[PDB]
Design a binder for this molecule. Sequence first.
Ligand SMILES: *[C@@H]1O[C@H](CO)[C@@H](O[C@@H]2O[C@H](CO)[C@@H](O)[C@H](O)[C@H]2NC(C)=O)[C@H](O)[C@H]1NC(C)=O
Lengths: 49, 49
Amino acid sequence: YSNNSIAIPTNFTISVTTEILPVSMTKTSVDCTMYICGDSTECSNLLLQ
Amino acid sequence: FLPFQQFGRDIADTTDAVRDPQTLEILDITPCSFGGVSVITPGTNTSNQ
Ligand SMILES: *[C@@H]1O[C@H](CO)[C@@H](O[C@@H]2O[C@H](CO)[C@@H](O)[C@H](O)[C@H]2NC(C)=O)[C@H](O)[C@H]1NC(C)=O
C-alpha cells in the first residue's frame, strides 16, 4: 500500500468450474395393515382401534 | 440348505423357507394379499367411470 501507486493487469485468463446441486429424493409408499399385522386377521381387528 | 439346516430367514429376520419333515424338501412362503391398487377417476360429479 502507498497513496500514489496503482496496479493494473496486462493479461487475462478464461476459467471453467463446476457446481453440483441435488433436486429430488426417492418416493416411497406404505401400507400399515401389511407392515404391522402382516397376514393375520386377528391383529387387523385389534388395529382397527 | 446345508444337510443340518431346517429354516431360512430374510434380511428382516423373518422366516421365508422351511423344510418338510417327512420328504425333506424346501418350500418358499409367500403372502396372499394385494390391497394396493390405484383408482383413476374424473370426479363422480361427471361420471361413474
Ligand atoms: C497474455 O497472456 C497470454 C496467455 O498465454 C499470452 O499468450 C501466450 O503468449 C506466448 C505468445 O505466443 C506463448 O508463450 C503462448 O503460446 C501464448 N499462449 C498460448 C496458449 O499459446 C500472451 O503472450 C500474453 N501477452 C503478453 C503481452 O504478455
